[PDB]
Design an enzyme around this catalytic site. Structure first.
Site, PDB file in Angstrom:
ATOM      1  N   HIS A  39      -8.174   0.141  -6.281  1.00 21.46           N
ATOM      2  CA  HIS A  39      -6.720   0.128  -6.388  1.00 21.46           C
ATOM      3  C   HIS A  39      -6.088  -1.078  -5.705  1.00 21.46           C
ATOM      4  O   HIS A  39      -4.858  -1.162  -5.645  1.00 21.46           O
ATOM      5  CB  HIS A  39      -6.122   1.427  -5.828  1.00 21.46           C
ATOM      6  CG  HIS A  39      -6.321   1.618  -4.355  1.00 21.46           C
ATOM      7  ND1 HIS A  39      -5.676   0.850  -3.409  1.00 21.46           N
ATOM      8  CD2 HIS A  39      -7.064   2.516  -3.666  1.00 21.46           C
ATOM      9  CE1 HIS A  39      -6.028   1.255  -2.202  1.00 21.46           C
ATOM     10  NE2 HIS A  39      -6.869   2.266  -2.330  1.00 21.46           N
ATOM     11  N   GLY A 141      -2.929   0.042   5.856  1.00 26.27           N
ATOM     12  CA  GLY A 141      -3.782  -1.117   6.040  1.00 26.27           C
ATOM     13  C   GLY A 141      -5.223  -0.798   6.371  1.00 26.27           C
ATOM     14  O   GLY A 141      -6.038  -1.724   6.459  1.00 26.27           O
ATOM     15  N   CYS A 143      -7.178   1.107   4.453  1.00 25.37           N
ATOM     16  CA  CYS A 143      -7.944   1.356   3.239  1.00 25.37           C
ATOM     17  C   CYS A 143      -9.137   0.412   3.173  1.00 25.37           C
ATOM     18  O   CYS A 143      -9.015  -0.790   3.425  1.00 25.37           O
ATOM     19  CB  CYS A 143      -7.062   1.186   2.000  1.00 25.37           C
ATOM     20  SG  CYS A 143      -5.796   2.460   1.797  1.00 25.37           S
TER      21      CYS A 143
END
Lengths: 299, 300
Positions: A39, A141, A143
């Site tokens: 993503h 942040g 991820c």
């Protein structure tokens, strides 16, 4: 008796920063491939119903900014394995350790290296909940942060952070892009199921309390595997199988307390409570210590 | 919700851990530049520990009596000296993995990460706080002496603790990196009594301020109290008394929120008399006292 995490040195050297357009998250650098959630190619407006296979066709190699500290890695190819992007870079990571990709089962534990913009900031030990989530500490942040276990010389990567559910819990995949649980990588209302207490881990933690001398919950009674699961099912405790009894074997020899004998103590702890007492300093029953963790930390 | 007790990444410290052997005793050492720091009782047998004469024991040792091992590479001891309760072993080769480091002495209530090691091999890392009785409550088996505590700020590692002794009550005691013990403890195998362990009040208050910032608000009340009346009640639950310095440190937390410090003290007083009643605060069923105000006014 503390909840210790694995040393993170071998993993710290593999974290990088991946930027595509405006989105910036963390990536895992092993050999010549950078792994990161897919993503990262989506804008905040593309997360409604993203067509990843169509979104990836538009992109090229020069749309990804991979940064390892001060150096810049050059992407020479891209691919997708389920829900993870595999970016082929031009230089191999010399910090690449002996590693392995494994998928874990709910109830198992591992350490998480929480990162922000490709920089490690913290580490902590956690267990995979029976509803396939983790009670982590992930802000915006983090991820791409990875979970791992450390065999003597081999690092087993088992988790990568993808999403944060609107409850405080977080969800992710394995390193092959297979999600843990019924979630999908889209911005929508996603429900985490009813969380259950890991009964086999509580029993292993009760054996650790006996090893440390705290033996007041011990009673003369025993129960059957079918009678305890009745009480365990009512208090939202996962049922106990025979393989669970076999894993608690080594802890049964060190202490001398059988499994069904200890189950009668836990059964009394759920119905009558703790009668205003403490086990290993806690008033609640811990379920994030596996039997293997107790053997690692004690014997 | 969710507020995890997070430890610092241990990579920069892992490359500084070594193994020190003198006779039969083997513990952990800290290798920075050209010096290896380790507890001085490494030169003691189990029989010397009752009444050790460290000056007498050390003058009888030579450089070749110390075996320092960084993995497989054996270091060469070229000299040695003793700073308070710590041995400084000068070696022939500098540690190329030496990070930018610092030595700091901490006060009770402050937090740091511990890298537990066994025979020069790291095994685990956890976060803890120095208790008001100058002890730490962690997991240290036999052979963990020499494990160090640290904080990382930017790129600078601040070493603040080295494990020396385990007390019969199950808790551990140690020194700073200059060899000065935290608290009244000594490196003898005598009956040493730790003081009464109390709850760090300023840490609980900072944690409660983080709760109202993260949504949880059920414990607030309309009352306020004076600093002296609160301490008279807090002392009853074995809570550390609050000073004016603690009130000033909580200032910015009470600025982002609307509740004065003495307002939050009235709420905590009500929590102590009523308990939790089945509910939680930031996913915790107990009052946490191992989160300092500095970390809360930053990781808000």
């Amino acid at each position: 008796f503390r909840k210790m995490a694995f040393p993170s040195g071998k993993v710290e050297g593999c974290m990088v920063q991946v930027t595509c357009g405006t989105t910036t998250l963390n990536g895992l650098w092993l050999d010549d491939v950078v792994y990161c959630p897919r993503h990262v190619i989506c804008t905040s407006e593309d997360m409604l119903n993203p067509n990843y296979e169509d979104l990836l066709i538009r992109k090229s190699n020069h749309n990804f900014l991979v940064q390892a500290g001060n150096v810049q890695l050059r992407v020479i190819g891209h691919s997708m394995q389920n829900c993870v992007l595999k970016l082929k870079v031009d230089t191999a990571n010399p910090k690449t350790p002996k590693y392995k990709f494994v998928r874990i089962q709910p109830g198992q534990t591992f350490s998480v290296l929480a990162c922000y913009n490709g920089s490690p900031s913290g580490v902590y030990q956690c267990a995979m909940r029976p509803n396939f989530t983790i009670k982590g500490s992930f802000l915006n942040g983090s991820c791409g942060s990875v979970g791992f276990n450390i065999d003597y010389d081999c690092v087993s990567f088992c988790y990568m952070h993808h999403m944060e559910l609107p409850t405080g819990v977080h969800a992710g995949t394995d390193l092959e892009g297979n999600f843990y649980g019924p979630f999908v990588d889209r911005q929508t209302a996603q429900a985490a199921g009813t969380d259950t207490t890991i009964t086999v881990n509580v029993l292993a933690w009760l054996y650790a309390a006996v090893i440390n001398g705290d033996r007041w919950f011990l009673n003369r009674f025993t129960t059957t595997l079918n009678d305890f699961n009745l009480v365990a099912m009512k208090y939202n405790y996962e049922p106990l199988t025979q393989d669970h009894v076999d894993i608690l074997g080594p802890l049964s020899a060190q202490t001398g307390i059988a499994v069904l004998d200890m189950c009668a103590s836990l059964k009394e702890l759920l119905q009558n409570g703790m009668n205003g007492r403490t086990i290993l300093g806690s008033a609640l029953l811990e379920d994030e210590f596996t039997p293997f963790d107790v053997v690692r930390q004690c014997s």
